[PDB]
Design a binder for this molecule. Sequence first.
Ligand code: ATP
Lengths: 147, 657, 268, 228
Amino acid sequence: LSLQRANVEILAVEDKPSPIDSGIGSNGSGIVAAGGGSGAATFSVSQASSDLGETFRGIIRSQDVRSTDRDRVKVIECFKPGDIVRAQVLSLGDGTNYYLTTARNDLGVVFARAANGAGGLMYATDWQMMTSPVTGATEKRKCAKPF
Amino acid sequence: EWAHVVDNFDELIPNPARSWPFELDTFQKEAVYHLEQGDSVFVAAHTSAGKTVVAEYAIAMAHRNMTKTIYTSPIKALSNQKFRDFKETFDDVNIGLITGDVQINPDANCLIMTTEILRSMLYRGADLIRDVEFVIFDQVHYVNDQDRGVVWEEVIIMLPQHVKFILLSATVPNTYEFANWIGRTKQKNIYVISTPKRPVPLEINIWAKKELIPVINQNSEFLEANFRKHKEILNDGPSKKTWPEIVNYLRKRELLPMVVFVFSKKRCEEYADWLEGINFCNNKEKSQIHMFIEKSITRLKKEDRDLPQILKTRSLLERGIAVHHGGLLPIVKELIEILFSKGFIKVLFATETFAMGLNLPTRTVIFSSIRKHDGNGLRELTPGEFTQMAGRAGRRGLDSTGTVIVMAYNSPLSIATFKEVTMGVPTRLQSQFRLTYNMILNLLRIEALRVEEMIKYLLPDYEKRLAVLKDTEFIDQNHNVLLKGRVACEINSGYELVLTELILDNFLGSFEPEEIVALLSVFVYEGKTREEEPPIVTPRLAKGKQRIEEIYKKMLCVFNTHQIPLTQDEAEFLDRKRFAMMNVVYEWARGLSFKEIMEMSPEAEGTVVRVITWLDEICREVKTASIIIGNSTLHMKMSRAQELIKRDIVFAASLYL
Amino acid sequence: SQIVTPGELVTDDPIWMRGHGTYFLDNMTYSSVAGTVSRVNRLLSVIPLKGRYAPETGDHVVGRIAEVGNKRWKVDIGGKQHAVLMLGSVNLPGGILRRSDELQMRSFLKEGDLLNAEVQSLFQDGSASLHTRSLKYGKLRNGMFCQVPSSLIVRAKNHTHNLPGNITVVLGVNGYIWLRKTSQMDLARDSWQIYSDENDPSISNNIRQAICRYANVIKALAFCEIGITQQRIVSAYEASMVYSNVGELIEKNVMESIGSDILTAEKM
Amino acid sequence: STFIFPGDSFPVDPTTPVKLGPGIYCDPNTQEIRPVNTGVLHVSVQTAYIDYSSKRYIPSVNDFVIGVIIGTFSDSYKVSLQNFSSSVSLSYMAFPNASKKNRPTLQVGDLVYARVCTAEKELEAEIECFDSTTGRDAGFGILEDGMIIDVNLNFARQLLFNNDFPLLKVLAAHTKFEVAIGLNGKIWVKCEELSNTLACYRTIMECCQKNDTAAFKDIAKRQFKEIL
Ligand SMILES: Nc1ncnc2c1ncn2[C@@H]1O[C@H](COP(=O)(O)OP(=O)(O)OP(=O)(O)O)[C@@H](O)[C@H]1O
């Protein structure tokens, strides 16, 4: 997150996982990122497209978070790192990132955790609120409409 | 796609967006009704008729519809005043300001900016334009200039199709053409609304020998018998017992609020000083004014509040007397304006700039004389200027009529000149389209673009100027720009050829940054004073004076060899004393309290700050020329000079914010 | 003039002001390149014998789109750096602020396209800024591309010429050349389709043959190191009609003969 | 008052509310208060925290720091507070009497004295060159010339906040000097002569290498005699 945009990684394209193999277990024990092991420094750049576990990347600009009042949007009051967000593609962008938008009632946060990913799951309560069931604490999000 | 001229409201608009505690005029109702239908409106009504009601209603409509509004004025002076007025008037609407100096609340729903700011914003393609519903142009009749004309037309052309327009101005001969052009270019319906007459009437009087003679009534009908009696009773300039003879006659008539127009910076101070033993504050107004002044000037540094101008203004303001001219600091000028707007000043001596813009009306307007000196000799006032000055005399509601007094100083005035000045159709101004060497050099670098065929839609002059440029090796025989011409293309202010010759002659290579900026003030200060120059400057900075004068003299001989007509500024260059400000600039850069500087400077505090401000552009141009020729020694010298002439007082915040 | 080499003393007079191509120590001035000494009033500088094209304000250039960026394009014009073309410096068919065109810039210009532009201003380091705000500039079509060194392009006031055989040539200052079929705008010189990739569907064989011959004679002129002008191009085209086959103009002896004939005819 | 280890029992009554300071963690799953650092636990509306030894700085609001300009952007500077750490940002409007015409004139490589104003967990920290809480401008801005000294965090805290720490008093008895103290582990000094600045640098380095505050005077005397 920053003050101007949010960076995401694409996990599924129309209810189909992308890629099929996520690379889990390729780096051994512990909790490691896909490119955080020993094989990342010995990948053959000139004989393949990308390395094991690489995904498409996207960018959500603050002016694309919603369709109205798109000059007073606070990014940290909408998303947090680690959230699962449903978005729609606007443009192919450059070779690094797509461009995405959430400016519709069915787009936004679908899964989130309390304490910035250290706690349990929360459930959506209002258009701009989620609630923790174990302790009745509330946080601000841009909730995608359920049901 | 057409312009329409127009000349059951309660049922038509049962739910108005805003309400006022008075009955609206017909033109206001028409403007409101046509704004409620979704059409653009052109309003051309007389002064002090209530044009700002339309803008307030537009802002209220935008707030109700949750859209944005942009307000634009040609003059940056009016932006701050309108910002303060709108901030006071509206409490539920966020107000913002965007100028070349400040930027407050860019995300607000109501924005006030300048035309060039909007031009740059449109060029950048800002995202806030998509939400804009109304754009308001105030004081349209002041945009008929050359520099103000192109930007306005470009802004009008570049605007998108979902933006509606509101236009406000005065009664001018060219009114239907602007609306027709806008409605043709944008293919929108716009209605032209005009008012019959002034809501408050004005009268013209003549003062002679301790009484006032009404000579024109409220119907603009001349009275010959009164003028004849004025001629009979009188059978030069003001005396030391003249302004007291007027400040008491009008005081007893309950017509006290007075604005006197004197066409001289120095004469206003003398006239104000001649008023001795006159007061208007009894015991509490003085204390309130003292508190306001003390709080306002807190933003300055402690040693900058002792300047003689501030002390004199404070002493005068405690009695209800003030002056308004271009020789004051901006803070003092805006302080005087704010105090005048609060009804604390009774007598004001003002220059011509007060009438232009500066929405601060009064009750009485007195003309010291009907003639003024504008550059080249004396000239009787044009009817347009007289109408502009005299029109600021009747405030709606608080006044039943507007009084105007024309003085007569122990000498009768001709009646034909009076009739010509007061009665007559005003004429729109025009420009002679001066041709400069920078324009010619810039046009020669453009691929294709046959120059001669565009000048027609000046030709004998263009050929003569090309011969000069080829003689001094700015261009070659095929009219290709050389290295010398490229430098001159980047110098815009006043003197391209003389400055270029100076730079390429290894001048400025021996002096220090403090001395370089001191010598360059000759191109900024016009030397209209007559006071003695400093007899001693330094052993150096006097050789620099001789070198500049010799180079200018050599360039002047080349101009006369080719028989080129010369402007007044260029002809009388060495005749004026344009080197008088070297010492002031030299000590400013060296580091010296601005109070000690004013003890020896030949110009007021307001003039000194203007000179330093104009010297910022000169340093930028010389820095650019150093990159073109590849002299890094000159580049670092000019960078140091810029940092040496910056002080806190030149960046003082406005009192309107 | 005088030929100097790097590290050579030019003058020891403490009266000159130093310019490009030199460095100094106290009153001694030295050369940093191989070139010729130039004097303008009190300014002293050295002009290099070889170098890349250096853009100047007002230049007429031909370039290729290299990168599609954030509200800007990168254009290759053969200099030391890429030029910059802002999105606000071009003309859009529909408009700029319609209630897109920032995320859809590839619908107008994309990587590999050739275009015609003018230099608007120079940045601090010499890189150029381009604009396409006239009907005479834009996308190039209906012809062929060729390249010559920029030092062989003679400076002139006009850079677009109509040639016999219904052919038009665009002579770039940077040395990039475009040959095409003459259009209505070219004849008149003497909305949404301005970004189209389609060529004219009625280009005949005679025009193709003429374009081939013009390219061959331009390459022949460049081989002999003769400056390229419109008059020389026409003269070389007319003098090559002896050979009936265009393909015989690629031999070295024919190119040298054409160049020598042009020079001899001019010198007479 | 007592020495504590991570995983130890927390000696505070669960009924009384206590505000938590550094070194103490509240579990997001079990809502349990436990210590995570090793050191001395101080208990003062009462506040508890653990004093532990550290060298790597982590930004916190209302801290006085010294930074280096490493890059200039369109609207702000890029500032480094420690080698190999994530950078912070300093805005062009974070100077006194700042406007779009009164731009700052700092370059890449300058030293600055500032205050931490924003330290959000999900964002990049921000600094300002004036105390916005009080409107005071006490020493914030560029530091010209001088020399920079690296120390650990406890030493910097002792210098800045403890008035009974005797180093500044013993230094003032040898020379006149200027000083700025940053809680990120930086000290800036300057004297009129280079030899005095060098002696101050050597004295500060040697005093930081030691732990006994009673030997500062002898160290200062020996170092100032060394430079003759
Ligand atoms: N219909 C009205 N009835 C009574 N008072 C009115 C009416 N309309 C406006 N006013 C009053 O006029 C006063 C000022 O008028 P206003 O400033 O709008 O004149 P103006 O035409 O804008 O002058 P300028 O030529 O300088 O732009 C306002 O304070 C307002 O109260």
